[PDB]
Symmetry: C3
Subunit: 341 residues, 3 copies
């Protein structure tokens, strides 16, 4: 970001990017992984930190998504939203605490493989308990275990109920945590969270139970110009799904999720990527097992410098044309050009 | 704010804050003063001023509210809006003039008690003629009476008609003004404004008449680490109300409004607050007298520095369970953590 | 704008303005050129550029419109939108390429007369193929013809299909280009673009054909404190129209468009303006010829400096009261005060 202020212990960055982005899929993209057409968007945000005393810092962050693929007519606001808005306090060797809209603690694990040029991170749904950005989350984090164990971190998070007007975007009270260890270029992590479901969620035809659960483990290697990561995750009554045939909606009673990525960064800027993502629903009403996501990725980002890049991301979709939920089976390739600051 | 530009007589500040905020009320908060659940939000704005010559400055300001308690789904924009957008000119000892969306001149008085950690300021409704932020307002202000009387200020404001698609947010043409005097830590102020009502407003079942009127007086003391203030106000056909029982809506034929606040700022950061707010509707159709607001406040803000604070604000709601308009009778307590720049 | 960052070859400007703005027209403005009432708005944007090496720069830009004439109620978002969002690369003497939401290439011509204090530029519709801002546009530009011919520029633009939920805001694939030559204070330009229409567009009662076409030529003189410009343009199946009598909608089978402007900039700040704009629809179903726009403009901007200005813009509307499409026939005058940075 661009440091717009640095005095008296307070630093503030404005940050953002403009992403010229286009998806190419068969026909109207209706049956594809990512869709088709212009997908241009921009981001803007601020990130501030104040040194309160030697041991205490305060911080806050806000981040917004502005779609650049809408007309200036009545659809102008489609897909626009606040991504993050939180504030907190960090006290040396004791931990940090923040509250607001922020990443759910299971993303402490899922973030490991969420590194593809355009796609990937498919199981880190927004407004989905602990796996993505979510509102009303209070998060305690500790780095290097009170300063005693270098590389050992943990987090505990309280998720406050959000009774919204859709089952998809709602949640009940919940709690979760994570622990990670980093060592010589490697990181390993485990995260788990459980929460009440709301009545509206329970009322949906797909998915059954009073609690939602999510956990994931991850390994990454991030050194020597290589980035390699693997996630496994499982969820109960937590992953949102829709049956396009019956026009029903709800949550998968269970999923088993696998994500893999490998990338290499050449000195001259090129960063090729390959990945695999498979999210498998189980015990789905009227169906049993059904794939939600299943693809191989081949892509590349070319970095001109830390402000400018382009990329192509090809998704070789393995979902078949007779997927029992109606999941699209066609490939999608994204091409993007990115200015960021 | 953060000064992002200062050359050739032009200074521009970017400013903002991230407010992690949660309300706690009985049950679903449906019958409470403030509601219940996550209430996180962020603000962003700019404020600019150009020195045109020795005697003339130009200025402009824009300010936005981004809710942080919405999902990234279809409710993403709920409660998002521009709070201020105006530009003006100030000519030494003659006065300033600005036009756009800005505070109505009666807020020159009501601002005195609008100082609680989270709540308070209940009668300074937005889009309500002269008491809060409102669109299309042209405002002339004079400080120290043409430079002749230190501490003596006055304002005159023309309110342009806003025919909106709700009675609640509309207004006709109007005019108002205020005068204030500050002396040795004290301020006293009086403000009055009157405006035409629109046909849509006249058509509502609650409230009757062709003119809306609002006035308020205020005293404050702001010195020696103390802040104490009192407002009295009266309105005619101006305060918006709803009868939850009859599902009718409109404006109170009259209100009488009292707001009191007392705060003390300790050197180490703590700023306790106590307050009282009672807004009383009179001659309401089918009812006569009915309280709209009636509570005692006890709260505190802890300031770490000028960038970081936390607060708790407890509203001891005195509205009774049989309030004839259906006003909520339950208490609400807010807890907030704030980073601002 | 305000340069918020300048290190390592990357420069970023934050920019914006607050425009206090009011329109005055007969009655409710329903039958006027511009409407009536408060029209205050604000703009915010960023514009970045990174020097990648001696010959290569990357850049990005985002720009937003925040209306300041809405209430903070349910109409809060009306007329808010992203105006621009794109990123690109410029390689010395070879050209630049950008993609995202940007000006259609025919605006390379229409921009010449789009210089009035408040109005004007009437044929540069947004989301209208090549004449205004539009989504999904890939644009190649060359300055000084590969460095061989000073003042000679050209552009080629690919317009990607946007199938939106309104005919008005949609378009099919298209291509266009422009060429301009500047010399001794003068500029001349020609621009043309053609694109497929979508099925939804073809389905509208007004307008008939599979292709939309737009072209325009322009001359400007911009020197010696004078600004004078002329545009001529023609369109096929491209200009959006509505018959208020039949409540039908679509596109004009053809238009012929003329825009003229002349302005002079006095040293002390005053910049008077006169203009003429006439857009004439032809072969309109059930009507034949009908004027869409037809007015003379007289106005002035007073510049205090590069940050602060005021203006008045008077539109002498020549549309007659029996216009066969229901186009408003009444005058409109805008008064504005502008702070910008
Ligand atoms: C002390 C550190 C705490 C780390 C807790 C997590 C341990 C597991 O390592 C996760 C490696 O990824 C494995 C992905 O397959 C998952 C199958 O169960
Ligand atoms: C870290 C990730 C490791 C994964 C290895 C990636 C290999 C790329 O996969 C190529 C599979 O092509 C199969 C083509 O099927 C098309 C059927 O319609
Ligand atoms: C020369 C300065 C002009 C000030 C005009 C206002 C005078 C009144 O003082 C306001 C003090 O608050 C009293 C609150 O009770 C109101 C009851 O009427
Ligand atoms: C500047 C303000 C001066 C106001 C003094 C504030 C005193 C705090 O009020 C405490 C009242 O408690 C009454 C409890 O009733 C509960 C009934 O459900
Ligand atoms: C080599 C430079 C290329 C320029 C191509 C455009 C040439 C025409 O000049 C445009 C002057 O405005 C005339 C407006 O009337 C239009 C009537 O046809
Ligand atoms: C560069 C532009 C050159 C155009 C010259 C502008 C002259 C201003 O026009 C004055 C026309 O007034 C006609 C009044 O009709 C009113 C009927 O309701
Ligand atoms: Mg279950
Ligand atoms: Mg009355
Ligand atoms: Mg035709
Ligand atoms: Na169910
Ligand atoms: Na009435
Ligand atoms: Na047609």
């Amino acid at each position: 970001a661009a440091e717009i202020y640095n005095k008296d212990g307070n630093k503030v960055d404005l940050y953002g990017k403009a992403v010229g982005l286009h998806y190419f899929s068969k026909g109207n993209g209706e049956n594809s992984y990512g869709g088709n057409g212009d997908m241009t968007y921009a981001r803007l945000g601020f990130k501030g930190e104040t040194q309160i005393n030697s041991d205490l810092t305060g911080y806050g962050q806000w981040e917004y998504n502005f779609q650049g693929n809408n007309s200036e007519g009545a659809d102008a606001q489609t897909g626009n939203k606040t991504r993050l808005a939180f504030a907190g306090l960090k006290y040396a060797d004791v931990g940090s605490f923040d509250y607001g809209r922020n990443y759910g603690v299971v993303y402490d694990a899922l973030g490991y493989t969420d590194m593809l040029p355009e796609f990937g991170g498919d199981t880190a749904y927004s407004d989905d308990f602990f796996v993505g950005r979510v509102g009303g989350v209070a998060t305690y984090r500790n780095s290097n275990f009170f300063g005693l164990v270098d590389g050992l971190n943990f987090a505990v998070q309280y998720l406050g109920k959000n009774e919204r007007d859709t089952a998809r975007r709602s949640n009940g009270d919940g709690v979760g945590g994570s622990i990670s260890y980093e060592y010589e270029g490697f990181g390993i992590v485990g995260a788990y969270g459980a929460a009440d479901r709301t009545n509206l969620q329970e009322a949906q035809p797909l998915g059954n139970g009073k609690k939602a659960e999510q956990w994931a483990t991850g390994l990454k290697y991030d050194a020597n110009n290589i980035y390699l990561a693997a996630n496994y995750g499982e969820t109960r009554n937590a992953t949102p799904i829709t049956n396009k045939f019956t026009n029903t909606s709800g949550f998968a009673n269970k999923t088993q999720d696998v994500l893999l990525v490998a990338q290499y960064q050449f000195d001259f800027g090129l960063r090729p990527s390959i990945a695999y993502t498979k999210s498998k629903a189980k015990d789905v009403e009227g169906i049993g097992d059904v794939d939600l996501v299943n693809y191989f990725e081949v892509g590349a980002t070319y970095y001109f410098n830390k402000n400018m890049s382009t990329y192509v991301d090809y998704i070789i979709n393995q979902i078949d044309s007779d997927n029992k939920l109606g999941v699209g089976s066609d490939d999608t390739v994204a091409v993007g050009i990115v200015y960021q600051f």
